[PDB]
Structure formats: structure tokens, C-alpha cells
Design a protein around this ligand. Structure first.
Ligand SMILES: *[C@@H]1O[C@H](CO)[C@@H](O)[C@H](O)[C@H]1NC(C)=O
Ligand SMILES: *[C@@H]1O[C@H](CO)[C@@H](O)[C@H](O)[C@H]1NC(C)=O
Ligand SMILES: *[C@@H]1O[C@H](CO)[C@@H](O)[C@H](O)[C@H]1NC(C)=O
Ligand SMILES: *[C@@H]1O[C@H](CO)[C@@H](O)[C@H](O)[C@H]1NC(C)=O
Ligand SMILES: *[C@@H]1O[C@H](CO)[C@@H](O)[C@H](O)[C@H]1NC(C)=O
Ligand SMILES: *[C@@H]1O[C@H](CO)[C@@H](O)[C@H](O)[C@H]1NC(C)=O
Ligand SMILES: *[C@@H]1O[C@H](CO)[C@@H](O)[C@H](O)[C@H]1NC(C)=O
Lengths: 83, 122, 557, 58, 48, 48
């Protein structure tokens, strides 16, 4: 192959995935929302360089099933969506 | 049934009769019609529970936000209006102003596809 | 010599073909010779030696249907003749072995021979059509039964008010996604042959169109999963304590001991469900899909349904069920006065869910059908490579080495067209099946929003009966719902009246119906027998008396 | 005698069993299904029972 | 495929317009819905 | 008015293509398994 193709054939930024081998992206231990899907829960984005990670479902919020306890609203907000 | 209304067996084209005949299907609707008159909206969610029809009409009137006294105080007027409305249905459909065209288009397309299959053999 | 009513091969005037001569009809004329109908094929012919006419008929176009109790059991057959009446003599000449299997019954579809008709009726087993079914030591044809005969004793001034309920749980299975498949067109039809590729690009972008079409299907499957699940971005966590007012959820909440955190019901579901082509992995793995399911499950046990419309507002489960009971039309007092009974019924009902799935052979059939379909299509597509497609050899290289350059181009073009035709057929099937899966995905998404995130008043939408709750469970290429419904039971008859007139004024019930055992009149709701003393609070005075049919004298006070 | 046979091989070019089509409706169904095992259900055959008679030259 | 979509639609009308009272606007006819009656037809169904 | 079911049609592939031609049987057989594919596809429609 051409010398330019060998850079993406074998390098330091190698991260095997269930989908297959990924070259040209660095695996980040942090998790964010999905930007470019890859497969098997792996998403990539161009932060300077292309970074691959695991997509995060969302913020981890815990509610309390405290019996004899209730939370009732004291305000409200009117919002308009778009379908 | 009345208003809705071959040689392709040589070439392999065949028509499979339906599993449920017209009489069998009509019997199913009779059960639903009988179920929804003697009982109101209860036979579809468990055992059938008997209820007089004016009582059922009053509570279905309550569904749209109209109090029960309206139906009872106008039972004769409502019944006459409902009775006349049903009668107009038969003659309106009997005129056949392409009203049943939705069902006939299904049959027409099926015959069109079979016809063009045989003609393609030439 | 000439032979009539036989399967001989007619050769009048050098016209080959096999048919039945029959007799002279159709009013042949000197101009009208060698006539043919819309079916063509010269259905009528004139004799060469004489002036008689012969009407050609295809040799026994019966199209018979054979019913089999499966080769796993003993061998038996009952041939059904379509269109042919009781005579059943299309071609009497035939091997003597199958002569008995032409016990004669004439159905609307036709004459059935090989089984005995039973005047008794049962649930349909092997559908034969025309309202007749079959069932195997010997197969018997029985008219199908629409159900158990029932009669309602309709009568005015009579009402049947339930006195018991029954918490029932039902299982609903819905496929959500297919298996993504990607194919390299160049590799599939032109294997290890650069010369073949030199001829493939001459065809144009036909290969590109097929690849692009499959790309849309593949990206749609991830969207379908993102629609059913991923409806709540917040990920809630089951409370440490699991005392949900005596209710038990240990069979649906994630098991900490399980390495995959799948619930015991989910684990049961997972076990039951079992070149140039590629099977791309789904974007959302099971460990993340199950996490999405746990978030919805943990968001409904606590915080009620509010979490589906904004912030999650904690609400004790015994209170939550009460509100849901108000929806079906049962005053909350019923839930609090019968909390022990309802909790036991819910616990007992959910316990039998696993046994119902395990016992049923057709359980998770909808999910398995998807797996058995696309896998079969891939196997069928592979077998098309061995197909000759009217070529000297299926091996591209073989054709090149064994044929001249001007003679080869004909054969590869013949082979290239065959492979391309087979490939595009598979893509079309996938596109059609994608629409069917998409409809289920949209339907599954709707049920997630209306049955889980809230309570639905639609009749026979979530579950059979009055809907109370709904719990989703992940499954391979699909979802499973556990609808909790309300079913009345133990109904008793009572005497009713449209209104009660007191002191010259009509009194209609504000809610519920008027009942009386025979001595005193009462007011009860329409879904639970709760007698109540008639007063002015529960009855509103509207209209003058003597205007309603069926009023009864009583003292409202 | 002209007949139709469903030959089965065991990956060694030897016949283990053969389905004699047009012998009876049970065997003809296997010929149409192209499988020695037939699942429970109703199936439509390909009309292998009939065979051409002697040709008539006219 | 189109027939199946219509068949599924007919099932919903069967289960909501007839088996109960539907609050969905313009679903079971025009106006405030009260009740409906099925009627069989060749290769189809008719609601009143 | 809503359609529910359509006409169940089944066609024998061999008879349609070859008009009682024994030699044509061989050729169609060589073509592949399209005959089984179409019959199976129509069977699913009929059952549905
Ligand atoms: C509330 O739940 C706890 C368990 O977390 C239980 O011990 C207690 O009896 C329940 N009732 C209260 C105090 O309302
Ligand atoms: C909360 O109520 C106050 C009323 O003065 C006002 O800030 C607003 O209406 C509410 N805030 C939001 C964020 O809705
Ligand atoms: C109602 O039914 C349940 C279960 O079917 C039973 O345990 C109970 O005794 C019945 N009666 C009452 C008053 O709950
Ligand atoms: C729920 O049922 C399981 C069944 O074995 C039992 O082990 C568990 O203790 C029960 N939990 C509650 C809270 O009833
Ligand atoms: C009928 O109801 C009245 C009203 O309380 C009661 O006095 C009487 O005992 C009841 N009779 C029965 C249940 O047979
Ligand atoms: C109740 O139904 C019977 C049945 O025909 C009828 O004769 C009677 O008049 C009805 N009573 C009332 C109050 O409607
Ligand atoms: C009682 O019933 C009779 C006959 O239905 C009616 O004329 C009368 O007005 C009713 N009320 C009293 C207080 O008598």
C-alpha cells in the first residue's frame, strides 16, 4: 500500500472493539453523549483529534421511595416543543 | 353483501378460500352486537354484566360530559332521532355513490394483477 | 390413431404439447381455425385428417393439497381437492397405492378424502379452509367452534354489580429490531477475480444502490431501539430498602448477584431466544438496554408516573396504586381496606409469569420468527452462488480459462446478471420486512409511553381489562410487557331504577347506580358493590318528578 | 419407467435414502418440500402424480 | 402490507369504538362519540 | 368502511413458466431456488 495508508494500518492509537479494530482514535476513559456511532456502545467525536469512548445513557439521579413522604410542585413552566 | 359483488386455473393461478366463511364472520358480529346491547362496555373487560339500555345510554351520555337527566327527560325524542338516523343509512348506502369503493378497490387490484400475469405470457 | 380423454401428447400439424382432446365445441368456422382463448395456447384445434374439433385441456390441473400430522408422529394423509366435487376423478389412471387416498366429505373448498368428518366441534388445529379444520390415531375433520355458547339475561330494572376483583398479569411480546446485514457487492459477485471487477464497474452504480439501501436499514434498527427505550435520559436507581407496601418486585428488578444484572424474568427470556456478508453489531448492547429498562422500572415503582412528564416526584407505592384504582373507577378506600389481599394476588400472579413462558412452546414466538427469517434469507442468498444461471460454470475463473475472450463475455454477462438479480431480491425482502419491524417499533414505543409512563384509558390496548400498571422487560430483538389489569368477579343481581323521586322531586345519582336488595335503596359504584345510604350529598336534584320513566317511590332525606 | 426421485447424499456421494415421488401424496409432499421430514400442517403439491401418455402423431 | 395496516386500524376501532367509549377526537366518527355497531362486509368491516 | 383481508392467491411456479415442457423443468431447476422463494413468500401472505 501507499505510505499514507500505512499510518492508518498500524499505529499507537489502536483500540480493538467488538465491531473490529479502530485506528486513528484514542480511547478515553470518560463517557459523554453519542456523536458518531461506531458499534457495541462505542461512539466517536472530534474534540483537536478524534476520540472514541463509551456512550453515556444520562445523568445518574436517585429518587427516594420514602413512605409517608410526598413531593408536590409549587411552581410550573409552560414550554413549546416542535414536532 | 349484494352491492359489493376462472380460466386462470390452466396456468397455475389459484385462489384459496378463506378460513372463516361469510356466515361465520357474520355470526361473530352478532355476538358483538348482542354483547354491546345487553351489557355496556363490560363484556370486553371480563364477564358480561346486564344493564338496561336507557341506563347504559345515560352513562355514555355522562362520558361526553352531559348529566344523566338529559337522556331520561328526552328519552322519546332521542329514540326517535336515533331510529330515523338508522333508517337513512340503508338508503344512503343503497344509492352507491362510490361509497363502498374502498372495499371494491381491493378486489379490483387483485384481479388486475392476475390479469396482467396471464397477459404477460404472450 | 386418435385418443380422447387421455393425457396423450397432441401433435396436430406439428404442434407439440400434452393435453386432453375432449370433444368439439366453440363453434369453429372456416375463418376461425386454430382458435385460442385469453389463456392462448390454442385451447381448441381442428383435426388434420378430418374436420372435427378438439378442445385441449391441461392434464389434471387439480392443485391438490395434502394434510400431514407431521412426520414426527405416524404417517397419515388427507388430500383436499380444490374446486373438484365429490366425484374426484381428474385422472383415474394412476398408481394403485395412492388410489385409496384420492371416507368422503364435501367441503366448500372441495371434496376431502382421507379423513372422517366428525359432527362435533373443537378449537381449530390444522386449518383446511371453508370453516373446517383437521386433527390427528387418525386425522378427523371437524367444523371450527367460535367459542363457548353464552346468553345474557337482559332485563330492565335489573343490574349485575361485581362484588370481587382479580388482579391479572398478561405478557405481551413485540419485536423491536432486525439484524443488520452489510454486503460488499464487488466481493459477492466477483470473487478473487480482478477481471470480473473490470466488468462489474462497467455495469454502473447498481452495486452502490444496493449497498446504500442496506445502510438505511442498518441505521434504522438503532433508531428503533432508541425509540422504545431511551425515553428517559435520567437513570434512576432502585431504593436500598425494597419494602414497597408489601408488594414484591424481586422478579423484575435487577438481581445484584447476576453478573449481567438481568432480572430473573429477563434471564429466562434471553435463554429461550437462540462470502462478503457481514452482521454488524447493534449500537446498544444488552447491558445498556437492560440498564435503560431498569431506569424505567425504577422510575415507576417510586415517583409514580410523574417522571414521564417532568421532574420525578416521590410518592409511596400504597398511595400510587390507590390513585391508579381511582382511574379504573374504584374509590381509593378499596385499596387501603384490601391492601393485604391485593398484594398477595399481585405477588401470586407475577410468580406464575415465568411458568407460563416456560410451559408455552410458542412463547417468544414473535421474536424467534424474526431470527428464523433473516437467517434463512442469508442462507438462501449464499446458495444462489452455487446456482448455474444458465452458464458453463459457476466459477468465474473457470469460464475465463475455458473460453475465448469474445465467447467469455457472453457467459460472464449471463452470470453477472444472475448474481445481481438474486442479490437485489434479498434487499427488497429486507426493505419490506423493515417496514413491518418499524411498525412494531412505533407500536412498542407508544405502549411504552402510554402504558408504562402513565395509565391508559383505552379499552383493550395495554391489557385485557382495566389497565393498572405496566412493566417492560428487555429481550433479544424485542421487548416484553407485563400489564397489570383489573378484572371484576363474583357478580350479583340487584334491582335498579333510573331515578328516585322524593317529596315530589326527582333524585338522580351523582355517581354510581341506584340499587336495592328489595327492602331499602342504595347507591353503589359501577365496578364494586359498596352500598351507601342515600342522602342529598350523593344525589343531585334536577328536574321535576313525573318526567322520567321508571322512577320508584322512596325517602331520600 | 419415467419417475421423479429425491436423491439424498451423506457428503460422500452415496445414497442413504431416496424419496419416490408420485408414489403417494405423502411422498409427493416431501418431493415438493425437498426434505425427508415434513412438519405438521397442510401443503400444496406440484401435481407429480400425472405422467404423459403415448404421443399421438397427427 | 397496506391491508395489514388497515386491518390493525380496524382492530383498534373494534376494541375502542365498540367495546367502550373513546375520547379521541375524530376517531369514532365526527362529534362526541357514544357507541358504534360493527357490520360485516366482503373483505372488510363497516362501523356505524 | 375499512378493508380487512385480501384474496389469497397461490401460483405453481413450474406450471406458469413451462407449459408442460419436460425439458424446461431442467432449466428452471438449474436457475435456482426462486421457485421455492416465491411459493414461500405467497404462503406467508395467505396465512397472514
Ligand atoms: C416504610 O418502609 C420501611 C422500610 O423502608 C418500613 O420499615 C416501614 O414499616 C414502612 N412504613 C412507614 C414507617 O411508613
Ligand atoms: C416560579 O414562580 C415565580 C413566580 O413569581 C416565577 O419565578 C416563575 O413564574 C416560576 N419560575 C419558573 C422557572 O417557572
Ligand atoms: C374475593 O376474591 C378473593 C380471591 O378471588 C378471595 O380471597 C376473597 O375471599 C373474596 N372475597 C372478598 C370479600 O375479598
Ligand atoms: C419476593 O418473592 C421472593 C420469592 O422467593 C422471596 O424470596 C422474597 O423474599 C419476596 N420479597 C418480598 C418483599 O415479598
Ligand atoms: C337489604 O338491605 C337492607 C338495608 O340495610 C337491610 O336492612 C336488609 O337486611 C337487607 N336484606 C338482605 C341483605 O337480605
Ligand atoms: C320492563 O321490560 C318489560 C319487558 O317487555 C316491559 O314490559 C316493562 O314495561 C318494562 N318496565 C319498565 C318500567 O320499563
Ligand atoms: C308513589 O307512587 C305513586 C304511583 O307510582 C305516585 O302516584 C305517587 O306520587 C308516589 N309518591 C307518593 C308520595 O305517593
Amino acid at each position: 500500500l501507499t505510505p499514507t495508508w500505512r499510518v492508518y494500518s498500524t499505529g499507537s492509537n489502536v483500540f480493538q472493539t467488538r465491531a473490529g479494530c479502530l485506528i486513528g482514535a484514542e480511547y478515553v476513559n470518560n463517557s459523554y453523549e453519542c456523536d458518531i456511532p461506531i458499534g457495541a456502545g462505542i461512539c466517536a467525536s472530534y474534540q483537536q483529534s478524534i476520540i472514541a469512548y463509551t456512550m453515556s445513557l444520562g445523568a445518574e439521579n436517585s429518587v427516594a421511595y420514602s413512605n409517608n413522604s410526598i413531593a408536590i410542585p409549587t411552581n410550573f413552566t409552560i414550554s413549546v416543543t416542535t414536532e | 353483501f349484494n352491492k359489493v359483488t376462472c380460466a386462470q386455473k390452466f396456468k397455475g393461478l389459484t385462489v384459496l378460500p378463506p378460513l372463516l366463511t361469510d356466515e361465520m364472520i357474520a355470526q361473530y358480529t352478532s355476538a358483538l352486537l348482542a354483547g354491546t346491547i345487553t351489557s355496556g362496555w363490560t363484556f370486553g373487560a371480563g364477564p358480561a354484566l346486564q344493564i338496561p339500555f336507557p341506563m347504559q345510554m345515560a352513562y355514555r351520555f355522562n362520558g361526553i360530559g352531559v348529566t344523566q337527566n338529559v337522556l331520561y327527560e328526552n328519552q322519546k325524542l332521542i329514540a326517535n332521532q336515533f331510529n330515523s338516523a338508522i333508517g337513512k343509512i340503508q338508503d344512503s348506502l343503497s344509492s352507491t355513490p362510490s361509497a363502498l369503493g374502498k372495499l371494491q378497490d381491493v378486489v379490483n387490484h387483485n384481479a388486475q394483477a392476475l390479469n396482467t400475469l396471464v397477459k404477460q405470457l404472450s | 390413431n386418435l385418443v380422447k380423454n387421455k393425457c396423450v401428447n397432441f401433435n396436430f400439424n406439428g404442434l407439440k404439447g400434452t393435453g386432453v382432446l375432449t370433444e368439439s365445441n366453440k363453434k369453429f368456422l372456416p375463418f376461425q381455425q386454430f382458435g385460442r382463448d385469453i389463456a392462448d395456447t390454442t385451447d381448441a384445434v381442428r383435426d388434420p385428417q378430418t374436420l372435427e374439433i378438439l378442445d385441449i385441456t391441461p392434464c389434471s390441473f387439480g392443485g391438490v393439497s395434502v394434510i400431514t400430522p407431521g412426520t414426527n408422529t405416524s404417517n397419515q394423509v388427507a388430500v383436499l381437492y380444490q374446486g373438484v366435487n365429490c366425484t374426484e376423478v381428474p385422472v383415474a389412471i394412476h398408481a394403485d397405492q395412492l388410489t385409496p387416498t384420492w371416507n368422503v366429505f364435501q367441503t366448500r373448498a372441495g371434496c376431502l378424502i382421507g379423513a372422517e368428518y366428525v359432527n362435533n366441534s373443537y378449537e381449530c388445529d390444522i386449518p383446511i379452509g371453508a370453516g373446517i379444520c383437521a386433527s390427528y390415531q387418525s386425522i378427523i375433520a371437524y367444523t371450527m367452534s367460535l367459542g363457548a355458547e353464552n346468553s345474557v339475561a337482559y332485563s330492565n330494572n335489573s343490574i349485575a354489580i361485581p362484588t370481587n376483583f382479580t388482579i391479572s398479569v398478561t405478557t405481551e411480546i413485540l419485536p423491536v429490531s432486525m439484524t443488520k446485514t452489510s454486503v460488499d457487492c464487488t466481493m459477492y459477485i466477483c470473487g478473487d477475480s480482478t477481471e470480473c471487477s473490470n466488468l462489474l464497474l462497467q455495469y454502473g452504480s447498481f452495486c452502490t444502490q444496493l449497498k446504500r439501501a442496506l445502510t438505511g436499514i442498518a441505521v434504522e434498527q438503532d433508531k428503533n431501539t432508541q425509540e422504545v427505550f431511551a425515553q428517559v435520559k435520567q437513570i434512576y436507581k432502585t431504593p436500598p430498602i425494597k419494602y414497597f407496601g408489601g408488594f414484591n418486585f424481586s422478579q423484575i428488578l435487577p438481581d445484584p448477584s447476576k453478573p449481567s444484572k438481568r432480572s430473573p424474568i429477563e434471564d429466562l427470556l434471553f435463554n429461550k431466544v437462540t462470502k462478503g456478508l457481514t452482521v454488524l453489531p447493534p449500537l446498544l448492547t444488552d447491558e445498556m438496554i437492560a440498564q435503560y429498562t431498569s431506569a424505567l422500572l425504577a422510575g415507576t415503582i417510586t415517583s409514580g408516573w410523574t417522571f414521564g412528564a417532568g421532574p420525578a416526584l416521590q410518592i409511596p407505592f400504597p398511595m400510587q396504586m390507590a390513585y391508579r384504582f381511582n382511574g379504573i373507577g374504584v374509590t381509593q378506600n378499596v385499596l387501603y381496606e384490601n391492601q393485604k389481599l391485593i398484594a398477595n394476588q399481585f405477588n401470586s400472579a407475577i410468580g406464575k409469569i415465568q411458568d407460563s413462558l416456560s410451559s408455552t412452546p410458542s412463547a417468544l414466538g414473535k421474536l424467534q420468527d424474526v431470527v428464523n427469517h433473516n437467517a434463512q434469507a442469508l442462507n438462501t442468498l449464499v446458495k444462489q452462488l452455487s446456482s448455474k444461471f444458465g452458464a458453463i460454470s459457476s466459477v468465474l475463473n473457470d469460464i475465463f480459462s475455458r473460453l475465448d475472450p469474445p465467447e467469455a463475455e457472453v457467459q460472464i454477462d449471463r452470470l453477472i446478471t444472475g448474481r445481481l438479480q438474486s442479490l437485489q431480491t434479498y434487499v427488497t425482502q429486507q426493505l419490506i420486512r423493515a417496514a413491518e419491524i418499524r411498525a412494531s417499533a412505533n407500536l412498542a414505543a407508544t405502549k411504552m409511553s402510554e402504558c408504562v409512563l402513565g395509565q391508559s384509558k383505552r379499552v383493550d390496548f395495554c391489557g385485557k381489562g382495566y389497565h393498572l400498571m405496566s412493566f417492560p422487560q428487555s429481550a433479544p430483538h424485542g421487548v416484553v410487557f407485563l400489564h397489570v389489569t383489573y378484572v371484576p368477579a363474583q357478580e350479583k343481581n340487584f334491582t335498579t331504577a333510573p331515578a328516585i323521586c322524593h317529596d315530589g322531586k326527582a333524585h338522580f345519582p351523582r355517581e354510581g347506580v341506584f340499587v336495592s336488595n328489595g327492602t331499602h335503596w342504595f347507591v353503589t359504584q359501577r365496578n364494586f358493590y359498596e352500598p351507601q345510604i342515600i342522602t342529598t350529598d350523593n344525589t343531585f336534584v334536577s328536574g321535576n318528578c313525573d318526567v322520567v320513566i321508571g322512577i320508584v317511590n322512596n325517602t331520600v332525606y | 419407467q419415467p419417475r421423479t426421485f429425491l436423491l439424498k447424499y451423506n457428503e460422500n456421494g452415496t445414497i442413504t435414502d431416496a424419496v419416490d415421488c408420485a408414489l403417494d401424496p405423502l411422498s409427493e409432499t416431501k418431493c415438493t418440500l425437498k426434505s425427508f421430514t415434513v412438519e405438521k400442517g397442510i401443503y400444496q403439491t406440484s401435481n407429480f402424480r400425472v405422467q404423459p401418455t403415448e404421443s399421438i402423431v397427427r
